[PDB]
Amino acid sequence: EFFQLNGYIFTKDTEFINTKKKIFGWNDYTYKIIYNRFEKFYSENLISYKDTEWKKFKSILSTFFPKSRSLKNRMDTNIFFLDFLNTYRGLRHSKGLPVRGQRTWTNAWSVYRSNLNLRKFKLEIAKRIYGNMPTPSLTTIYLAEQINYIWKLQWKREWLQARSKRLKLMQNEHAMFKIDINSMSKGYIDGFDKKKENTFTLGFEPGFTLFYLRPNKIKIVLNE
Amino acid sequence: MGKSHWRLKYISKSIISKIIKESIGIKIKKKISVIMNKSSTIPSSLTDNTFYIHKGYKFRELKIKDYHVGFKFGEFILTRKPNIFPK
Amino acid sequence: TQLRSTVPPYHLTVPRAFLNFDGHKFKNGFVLCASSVKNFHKHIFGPDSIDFPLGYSHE
Amino acid sequence: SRQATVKHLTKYEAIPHYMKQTLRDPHEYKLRSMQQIKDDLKDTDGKFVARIDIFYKDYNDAKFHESAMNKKVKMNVHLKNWKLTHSQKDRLSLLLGNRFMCNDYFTLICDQYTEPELNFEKLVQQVQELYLECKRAP
Amino acid sequence: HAASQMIVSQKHFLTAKEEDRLKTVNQFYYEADTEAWDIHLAHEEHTIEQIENFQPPKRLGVDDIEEQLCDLPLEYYDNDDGFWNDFIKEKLNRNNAAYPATQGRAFFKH
Amino acid sequence: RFYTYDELIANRDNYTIKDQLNHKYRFSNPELIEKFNLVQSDKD
Amino acid sequence: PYIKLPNFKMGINPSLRSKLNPLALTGTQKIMLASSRIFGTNISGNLRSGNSELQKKFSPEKELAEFNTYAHDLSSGFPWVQYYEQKERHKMMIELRKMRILMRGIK
Amino acid sequence: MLFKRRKDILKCKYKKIYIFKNKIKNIILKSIFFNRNIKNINRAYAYMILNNSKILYKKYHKICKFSGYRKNVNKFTGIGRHELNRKATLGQLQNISMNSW
RNA sequence: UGAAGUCAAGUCCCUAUGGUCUUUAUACGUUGGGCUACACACGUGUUACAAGGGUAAAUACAAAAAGACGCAAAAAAGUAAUUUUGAGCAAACCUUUAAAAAUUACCUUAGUUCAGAUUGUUUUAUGAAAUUCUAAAACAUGAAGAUGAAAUCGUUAGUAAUUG
RNA sequence: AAUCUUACCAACGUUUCAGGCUUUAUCAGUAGUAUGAUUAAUAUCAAAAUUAUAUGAUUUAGUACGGAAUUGCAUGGCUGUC
Ligand SMILES: [Mg+2]
Ligand SMILES: [Mg+2]
Ligand SMILES: [Mg+2]
Ligand SMILES: [Mg+2]
Ligand SMILES: [Mg+2]
Ligand SMILES: [Mg+2]
Ligand SMILES: [Mg+2]
Ligand SMILES: [Mg+2]
Ligand SMILES: [Mg+2]
Ligand SMILES: [Mg+2]
Ligand SMILES: [Mg+2]
Ligand SMILES: [Mg+2]
Ligand SMILES: [Mg+2]
Ligand SMILES: [Mg+2]
Ligand SMILES: [Mg+2]
Ligand SMILES: [Mg+2]
Ligand SMILES: [Mg+2]
Ligand SMILES: [Mg+2]
Ligand SMILES: [Mg+2]
16 A cells, blocks of 8 residues: 655655655654654654554644645746746746845856756746757747747837838748747847847747747748 | 735825725726836736836836736836846 | 643653652651752752752752 | 843743642732721821832933933832731732832832923822722731 | 725635646746636546645734734723722812813814 | 813713714715715626 | 644633633732723733834934034024125126126137 | 035925924824734724825935035934044044044 | 155045036936846955764853933743833943853764755734845755865964854 | 935926015915825815914015036145055
8 A cells, every 4th residue: 555645655664754855845843743743752663564553644644734735846836826927036037047136246156056946847838839859949949938028018119110120021022031049049139229229039929939830931040 | 925914015095096996987097007116016906907017218018817916016027128248 | 831742751650650759658658859960050959940848858 | 240141940841730839819808998998097087198208310411302301200108107918018019010119118100291290299199099009908 | 995905915825726737738928828727727627536725824804803802991990899989080070170181183073 | 051071971972973984085075985886886 | 835734732822911801800910900000001912012102202303403403504593694705706706707708709 | 596405404304394293193003003903904094094195204314414415424423424524623523532442 | 643745646426616518407306217237257255165063951251332213121922033011220220242162962974963055935023115126033945065276365472263 | 225315217397595684466264284185206276174373375576596517637625555
């Protein structure tokens, strides 16, 4: 037999002590609370081959945590749910920048390496649409995909200008043009009037990459 | 993170004026849709409504939905245009 | 708030035999108790810490 | 100088419910009436007088906006005129609260108003209201 | 209705159904193709076992109270015998003669 | 005449006042209160 | 996420204000209440009441007492001052510029 | 119009006078808001009025009467930094002396 | 405590002032935003890479300084930050202030009961207001780092270093 | 450097003295506030309650308009360093 909780799987050969390093959310204080409920020591085993321990094991141990859930997955959703609504914190988890107002001109290195939740949660989303293409190409897309969605909302005056230029030659020439996704992954752009004073980048509507990759006149630029 | 729950959420003079104008049925319009004081929380009555939020020298647009409730206006808007080192 | 999720020894079985300062109960009997404070530093122990009658103690 | 505060372990934690101490409320009884009190002072024919000691301060600095610095009026009261019983004394030590009190006298302070007169009469209204509520016990 | 919305206007807590759908979703964003999320919730699959959401935090309502207290008066008098009944009437009537309390009271009326 | 201080304590609890309460626009523009009744009634 | 765990301790967190049963009061409880009428003390639970903000002291006028000195600007505090010489220099220097301004306008 | 000092002194003046008179109002409203034992509504309706007031006369910040400079101030003297270096030359400060510990 | 005066050193943007320019705007008030951005790189400084350390429990000794648009004891609650409460003092009188160490016991050289960043979510405090853009506590996350190339800096006794 | 600060960017608005003195004209059921409505905000409007306090509130003209605008290689003043 077995018993599952918090995404960890229990059996009658386990040792409830050495689950400490493994489970995600239950280090020290909770086990003390738990062994108070079992009325036993750390050194004793809370599990045995006899059924009395097993049913007693499950009845107590279910009260702490709701069944068929985890803490790890709950954590990532509370992160993605922020970026899922197009929030400020949504970007800073994605790019690798700090969240808590921490500075950037000198030191944000521990964010760029450790925080990797929202990133991996998007690679799986890209596979659900654009298949099992290798990762570094997929990275080019949803980076390029969010950017236009930002410029569409926040800087709407600029998106329209990128949209207008595309549609003029569309009716007149019927010639080919291209999209520089590899330029948009790094954040480079084109197609408006600046204060300083064929390919297009920004004028699309969201989800456009689905429209073109998976249906001659238009040709994609992923790599270089 | 946020404030303690008992420290009730902030809604300024303005939005309290707007919530009443909703209550009368007065529709939202050019100036009434305008928003300032971003720290004011995003109330619940004003679902199904557009509000042109202010930053700098221009504005941003959004609609309210039940998921957007509870948050702050300024957490959906970007002020500082991102920085990219050129080639 | 003093116990904080522990077991007193007046509920533990074996200490019940000896916890009770009942020497009068023993015909031809006597009781002797002591207080070790090696593990503690400057620990004032006395019959005020334990609510304990006067007279039956010796500093 | 001041030595540092330390929380000593006065009482051990786990002591049996039967071996603890519990003390009833000695102030639970039938409170006295009024003529019982007046019958005590028959030597004086309905007239009581209290000996007290009035401290008071002044400053050269109590002016335009610091003129409130002269509002305290500290007082002491002597008790040997008060034929205080064992039960009347403890009642009086509770009303004052965690305040100074001796067998000989106790303090009384008021800083409720700006002018010290108004803070002085209030002490008299307290001394009366404490003597009666104290001698309402036997 | 205006004051309550500094209470009811409150962050949304997620149900376990919503989070299994956060994974199986395809769209990265919400405001773009909003209706598809409403559709992607509507898919029913009872093959999975019964589900228990976490408990939300100890929220508190509009009419609720955090900690109730026993009501008392300002000046608690033991008047069972009734002696203090006389000490009070002269006291208050003395105060009004010197410093009355008959004020315009622009705010409250009684 | 004027009342005394003691006589007013007799009329302490006699609350004669009619419809006294925290309000908004009432004495200035009671029309909007009527609209506020219509709208939330229409939603029922 | 919000990790909640059960508290195996029970009962209201005790307070002086909560031990009181006004229908059945002890002697030690009527006595403290008899002190509160005298000195105006307060009895409240472990939780926050507003008395800490009613008892506070907040003296903003003491700053105005500095602004009302007018040591920095005599004319605002003592308008009878009239700096005659400083006005003269202010007028001479102006008029001599206007000589320069017109004579440079031609030149 | 007025030069910078004589103007800015008035701004920081009117901010205090507002506070001096709305003192009792803003102490009672804020009293209710932190009274946990009461229901939430009355705790909020006070919070509603507590914000329905001129916040502009509440953004107070210190200033020196003489220099017009705001950042560094000596509360013990009520005057600034660039000035005390001057008066110390003239010895105009009363009872002060140079710390030699 | 620090001469003469040099480095046309620095500042007209603390305030003053000569010349120059502007005066329906290069002036003024308010609202919101910004000064907190982020490829690479420099200077400064705190904390660590452990066992002359980490931790738990019981429990000692200070100076100097400050206090009413304040300090806030005692008792009580909380896991803890902290809160209720406000005796007493405008003062060598009342109040706010220690740790390291020492004692007893565990951990037994391991990227570890070391390290402690970063992130999620409640709670705690101030304020009108914390999202842009604050600090702290807890449950949980638990990355780099294993005493640092060439080069280079401080110190002369109650000094270095360590402790608060 | 959360607002103010803060000079900078964007936008709405103001166009010449705070107090005191002199002066032109009107209003006085008007004026004011811990009041009320109004705007994002300053502003602006006003009679449900409240305040009435000696010789008012508002307005024209005048009484050194203003300036973190520039030149520290025209200077004071303040200061570093040898
Ligand atoms: Mg923050
Ligand atoms: Mg021994
Ligand atoms: Mg307190
Ligand atoms: Mg400040
Ligand atoms: Mg220069
Ligand atoms: Mg700076
Ligand atoms: Mg160490
Ligand atoms: Mg201890
Ligand atoms: Mg002490
Ligand atoms: Mg204490
Ligand atoms: Mg006192
Ligand atoms: Mg030690
Ligand atoms: Mg590691
Ligand atoms: Mg550790
Ligand atoms: Mg090692
Ligand atoms: Mg700012
Ligand atoms: Mg500003
Ligand atoms: Mg300027
Ligand atoms: Mg130079």
